[PDB]
Swiss-Prot record, chain A:
GO terms for cellular component: cytosol; cytosolic large ribosomal subunit; preribosome, large subunit precursor. The lineage of its organism: Eukaryota, Fungi, Dikarya, Ascomycota, Saccharomycotina. One of its GO terms (biological process) is ribosomal large subunit assembly. The keyword Aminoacyl-tRNA synthetase does not apply. Its main location: cytoplasm. Keywords: Cytoplasm, Isopeptide bond, Ribonucleoprotein, Ribosomal protein, RNA-binding, rRNA-binding, Ubl conjugation. Component of the ribosome, a large ribonucleoprotein complex responsible for the synthesis of proteins in the cell. The small ribosomal subunit (SSU) binds messenger RNAs (mRNAs) and translates the encoded message by selecting cognate aminoacyl-transfer RNA (tRNA) molecules. The large subunit (LSU) contains the ribosomal catalytic site termed the peptidyl transferase center (PTC), which catalyzes the formation of peptide bonds, thereby polymerizing the amino acids delivered by tRNAs into a polypeptide chain. Belongs to the universal ribosomal protein uL23 family. This is Large ribosomal subunit protein uL23. The chain holds residues 72 to 142 of 142 of the full protein.
Swiss-Prot record, chain B:
N-terminally acetylated by acetyltransferase NatA. This is Large ribosomal subunit protein uL4A. It comes from the Eukaryota. The chain holds residues 53 to 104 of 362 of the full protein. Changing R46E: Leads to a slower growth at higher temperatures but allows RPL4 assembly into the 60S subunit. Component of the ribosome, a large ribonucleoprotein complex responsible for the synthesis of proteins in the cell. The small ribosomal subunit (SSU) binds messenger RNAs (mRNAs) and translates the encoded message by selecting cognate aminoacyl-transfer RNA (tRNA) molecules. The large subunit (LSU) contains the ribosomal catalytic site termed the peptidyl transferase center (PTC), which catalyzes the formation of peptide bonds, thereby polymerizing the amino acids delivered by tRNAs into a polypeptide chain. Component of the large ribosomal subunit (LSU). Mature yeast ribosomes consist of a small (40S) and a large (60S) subunit. The 40S small subunit contains 1 molecule of ribosomal RNA (18S rRNA) and 33 different proteins (encoded by 57 genes). The large 60S subunit contains 3 rRNA molecules (25S, 5.8S and 5S rRNA) and 46 different proteins (encoded by 81 genes). uL4 is associated with the polypeptide exit tunnel. uL4 interacts with its chaperone ACL4 and the nuclear import receptor KAP104.
Swiss-Prot record, chain C:
Belongs to the universal ribosomal protein uL24 family. This is Large ribosomal subunit protein uL24A. Keywords: Cytoplasm, Ribonucleoprotein, Ribosomal protein. There are 2 genes for uL24 in yeast. The keyword NAD does not apply. Transmembrane segments: none annotated. It comes from Saccharomyces cerevisiae (strain ATCC 204508 / S288c) (Baker's yeast). Disulfide bonds: none annotated. SUPFAM superfamilies: Translation proteins SH3-like domain. It is found in: Cytoplasm. PANTHER family: 60S RIBOSOMAL PROTEIN L26 FAMILY MEMBER (PTHR11143).
From Swiss-Prot, chain D:
Its main location: cytoplasm. PROSITE patterns: RIBOSOMAL_L39E (PS00051). InterPro entries: Ribosomal_eL39, Ribosomal_eL39_CS, Ribosomal_eL39_dom_sf. GO terms for biological process: cytoplasmic translation. Signal peptide: none annotated. The keyword Nucleotide-binding does not apply. GO terms for cellular component: cytoplasm; cytosol; cytosolic large ribosomal subunit. It comes from Saccharomyces cerevisiae (strain ATCC 204508 / S288c). This is Large ribosomal subunit protein eL39. The gene is RPL39. It is found in: Cytoplasm. Component of the large ribosomal subunit (LSU). Mature yeast ribosomes consist of a small (40S) and a large (60S) subunit. The 40S small subunit contains 1 molecule of ribosomal RNA (18S rRNA) and 33 different proteins (encoded by 57 genes). The large 60S subunit contains 3 rRNA molecules (25S, 5.8S and 5S rRNA) and 46 different proteins (encoded by 81 genes). eL39 interacts with YIH1. The lineage of its organism: Eukaryota, Fungi, Dikarya, Ascomycota, Saccharomycotina.
RNA sequence: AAACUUUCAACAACGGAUCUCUUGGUUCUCGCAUCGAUGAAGAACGCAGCGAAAUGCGAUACGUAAUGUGAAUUGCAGAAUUCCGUGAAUCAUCGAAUCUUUGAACGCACAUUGCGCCCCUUGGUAUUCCAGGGGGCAUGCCUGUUUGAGCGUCAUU
RNA sequence: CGUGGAGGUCAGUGACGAAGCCUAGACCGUAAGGUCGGGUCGAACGGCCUCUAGUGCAGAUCUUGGUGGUAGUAGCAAAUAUUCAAAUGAGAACUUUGAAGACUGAAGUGGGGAAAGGUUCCACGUCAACAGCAGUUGGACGUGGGUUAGUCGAUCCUAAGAGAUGGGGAAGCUCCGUUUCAAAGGCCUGAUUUUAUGCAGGCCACCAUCGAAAGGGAAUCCGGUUAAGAUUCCGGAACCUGG
RNA sequence: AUAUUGGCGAGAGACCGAUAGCGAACAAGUACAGUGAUGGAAAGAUGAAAAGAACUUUGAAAAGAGAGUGAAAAAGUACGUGAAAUUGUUGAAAGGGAAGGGCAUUUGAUCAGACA
């Protein structure tokens, strides 16, 4: 996933099951004050939902990762 | 108990060279299947003349 | 003997009520008597043991050793007096579990609620 | 069957998370009669029947 | 851990003597199978080759 | 530690709302630290603190509605008595105690008189 | 030809997971469940099956509601709260 | 003559009988009446700082609030005020709440995590389009209200 | 004569060793059996007078569990076949690399998929069990990582067929039937300026719904990239439906 | 007044004591088999307390040998007592196509009683 932070400008999250692409796109835009270009989601084999969140080109995913903490 | 020993669905197989006449537990796969039942001599069977 | 209908005299009931008793009912069972010093002092025979009391063992191989309780281990029906241990072969130390009916309390650790308990059971305390 | 329904998939996820040995620290508890994971499953030995 | 790891070896022994290839081999032997012993085979069609 | 039950009851509705969002910011951060650290026992206490706020906020909204419908018939179904099914479908204390007009003249006339046989 | 070579042909499921009893006894073409009677209104049970009942009577489940009824009766179906004496 | 075969003791094996145990079963007596459209019995999936199962519970998820007792829990960690007290605990009690997706199952539908319509409300240059949040939409029957239907029929204009 | 429990009695025996078990050691009774010594072990058990019964086994092609002779024997022989050095290792006919020798020979021992299986896919650690020889290796065991779609499918439509409602049968669970002896229901513009829609007034008679991951069907392709993923992510370039 | 192998809370037994008693004393309607209706087991016990054997020395390691804890390892997570089939080692004895049995004595081994 950390490879996908640098190259693709993509954050990776675990998301609650009931959400769809509209609600994730609204929640990331609320919590982090960051515009989203497109969200791509998959269901993991262990039963939870992953979500690849690509940010826009104006915003950098390296700088947001320091604020939340994971790097 | 009046029903103790009778919670089984056995049935006899017939007359072969290598097997007895006691009714045996039907089905297969558990390890109880193929054992004697319903007799006073059988393991897991009722006793003779159940005390009333 | 037994002269009531709610009480039971059955052996299989009394062990099963003991082994599956909850912790609040294990507190009353894990009780320790007071010494003849304190029995003259407060006027009460027995008390439930507490964490911070000082105690003297009176029966067992460890008879004659005294120390403060570390912690009342209710899940094993046992009490771990401090300074009463067995050292292992590798230098490590292991506490010895005791039953608190074989203990004798010499000093009490008084809180507010322990005073009212002494008042309840008829104590003089001071 | 690689075209699976979700109800079929959700029961795979529960069988996947039960496919583990017993934890090591449960050996150390008081009055442990539990020894091994006696409900352990394997794809080779026993089919789980959907 | 070595206290716990040796308890894995102590509890493994009973399954190794019965040659279980896992802790998940619970294939059960039927005591007496029905098609082996319940039959009388005379002139005509028979129960196998 | 964590939040207390009785302390939150003195707070207002605007403050019980802002209490909760600041708690959920902590629980978001502690799930981040849960993967870096091997064991993080603090996350139990901040989790029950969120549940303690939601009980109090639900209670202040429900005791508002009870005084809204107080003294007026037809309160809603979750606010009524739960008692059981067959006891709600039954005659009340007034209706079972009703008796026809012919019996009421009789019970006044001939009640069960209290007597004794000694002398 | 009736034994082991025809057992290779068995790969179409007759039954699927039931929604009510979760039993894998739902016949597809009949659109009914052989174990628990669904989509009929009543649960399929019979008095010839004694062990059929004991697998699915009350008490084998969680009893989310009936485990509190004997306690709420013993107090007497009371309301309000305790008075902090 | 050893080897080998057979019989017997000693010690060691293979195996789990015997004796002594016991939180379970069985039978009799005694008391009691309390499931559900305010969503039950059952079912599926989820939850613990470290759990697969039993047990507990429902996105408030081995619980929360209320009450009682008055210092633990324990396999390791952790927290030290939570220790002369609005207060520990997998305690007990239980009168207030939550209660996912289902189930008589109730908007239609189901081998689909499928598909609508209505109201209030927020965001997108929006009564109509798309989306987010809250409350809704079954059938049979009863009493009542409201708008109606028929040369069935009465006065009247 | 013996065994399990019951009421008595010996103020019976017992952690200085009760029962149980072994014992080509002793004694008694014609016999069922009883007593004693020695070895083992660790906690309860007898004699007598009576009471009671789930009370005595060698056999039932008996029942459950356990062990032998046969026997280190039958066997491990279809699918043309393996060889040498080096590294790894306590160990190599079997693992890895290189050098040789062959085979499947495009209706394949190759490259993908549908049913079906459910993590076997990949990496790190590692061999008690399994792989009917072996094992350092594995589809094993231990811990983790990994499936991204406006365009590919499902979802939509109907086929043979399943099946509610209006009704009529049936003591009844429920059976018939699918446009039927039913009062079975929607859409458009307005005239707008209390603003909501009265009404201008028409048109329609079609009257649930389920049924194909091979039929019908709006719309995407190349090039890169990973230990494992792609017509799905990156870069580049297009098309479609609702607005 | 009367009925009750279900639910809930109680008390008892000339009952069974782990092949018995319910199928289930334990993570039991569990594991497992069958498309499905249904079928459906096995499995209690170290010791008072884990004090579950540091260290030393052989071997790659498993384990062994010493030491060591404990009243006892003849209680070492195969764990109380550990019978018989069956097997190993030592010792005694016999043996030309079975073995074992009965009556009597020799031979070798072995053993209590008893006179004061």
């Amino acid at each position: 996933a950390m490879k996908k932070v640098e190259d693709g400008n993509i954050l990776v999250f675990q998301v609650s099951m009931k959400a769809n692409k509209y609600q994730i796109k609204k929640a990331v835009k609320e919590l982090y004050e960051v515009d989203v270009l497109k969200v791509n989601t998959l269901v993991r084999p262990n039963g939870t939902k992953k979500a690849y969140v690509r940010l826009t080109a104006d915003y950098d995913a390296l700088d947001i990762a320091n604020r939340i903490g994971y790097i | 108990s009046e029903k103790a020993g009778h919670q089984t669905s056995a049935e006899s197989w017939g007359t072969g060279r290598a097997v007895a006449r006691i009714p045996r537990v039907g089905g297969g796969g558990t390890g109880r299947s193929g054992q004697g039942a319903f007799g006073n001599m059988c393991r897991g069977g009722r006793m003779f003349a159940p005390t009333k | 003997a037994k002269q009531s209908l709610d009480v039971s005299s059955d052996r299989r009931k009394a062990r099963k009520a003991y082994f599956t008793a909850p912790s609040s009912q294990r507190r009353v069972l894990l009780s320790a008597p007071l010494s003849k010093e304190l029995r003259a002092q407060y006027g009460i025979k027995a008390l439930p043991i507490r964490r911070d009391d000082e105690v003297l063992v009176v029966r067992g191989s460890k008879k004659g050793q005294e120390g403060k309780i570390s912690s009342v281990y209710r899940l094993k029906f046992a009490v771990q007096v401090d300074k009463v241990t067995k050292e292992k072969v590798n230098g490590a130390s292991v506490p010895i579990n005791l039953h608190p009916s074989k203990l004798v309390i010499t000093k009490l650790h008084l809180d507010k609620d322990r005073k009212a308990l002494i008042q309840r059971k008829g104590g003089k305390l001071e | 069957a690689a075209q699976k329904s979700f109800r079929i998939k959700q029961k795979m996820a529960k069988a996947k998370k039960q496919n583990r040995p017993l934890p090591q620290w449960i050996r150390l508890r008081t009055n442990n009669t539990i020894r091994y994971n006696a409900k352990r499953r394997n794809w080779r030995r026993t089919k789980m029947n959907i | 851990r070595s206290k716990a790891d040796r308890m894995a070896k102590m509890e493994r022994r009973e399954r190794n003597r019965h040659a279980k290839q896992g802790e998940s081999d619970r294939h059960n032997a039927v005591s007496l199978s029905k098609h082996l012993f319940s039959g009388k085979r005379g002139v005509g069609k028979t129960d196998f080759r | 530690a964590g939040v207390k039950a009785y302390e939150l009851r003195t707070k207002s509705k605007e403050q019980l709302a802002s209490q909760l969002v600041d708690l959920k910011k902590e629980l978001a951060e502690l799930k981040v630290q849960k993967l870096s650290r091997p064991s993080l026992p603090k996350i139990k206490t901040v989790r029950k603190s969120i549940a303690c706020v939601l009980t109090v906020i639900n209670e202040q909204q429900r005791e508002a509605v009870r005084q809204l419908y107080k003294g007026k018939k037809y309160q809603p179904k979750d606010l009524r008595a739960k008692k059981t099914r067959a006891l709600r479908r039954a005659l009340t204390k007034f209706e079972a105690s009703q008796v026809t007009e012919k019996q009421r003249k009789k019970q006044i006339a001939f009640p069960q008189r209290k007597y004794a046989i000694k002398a | 030809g009736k034994g082991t070579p025809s057992f290779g042909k068995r790969h179409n499921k007759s039954h699927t997971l039931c929604n009510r009893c979760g039993r894998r006894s739902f016949h597809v073409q009949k659109k009914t469940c052989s174990s628990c009677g669904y989509p009929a209104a009543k649960t399929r049970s019979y008095n010839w099956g004694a062990k059929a009942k004991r697998r699915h009577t009350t008490g084998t489940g969680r009893m989310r509601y009936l485990k509190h009824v004997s306690r709420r009766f013993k107090n007497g179906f009371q309301t309000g709260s305790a008075s902090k004496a």
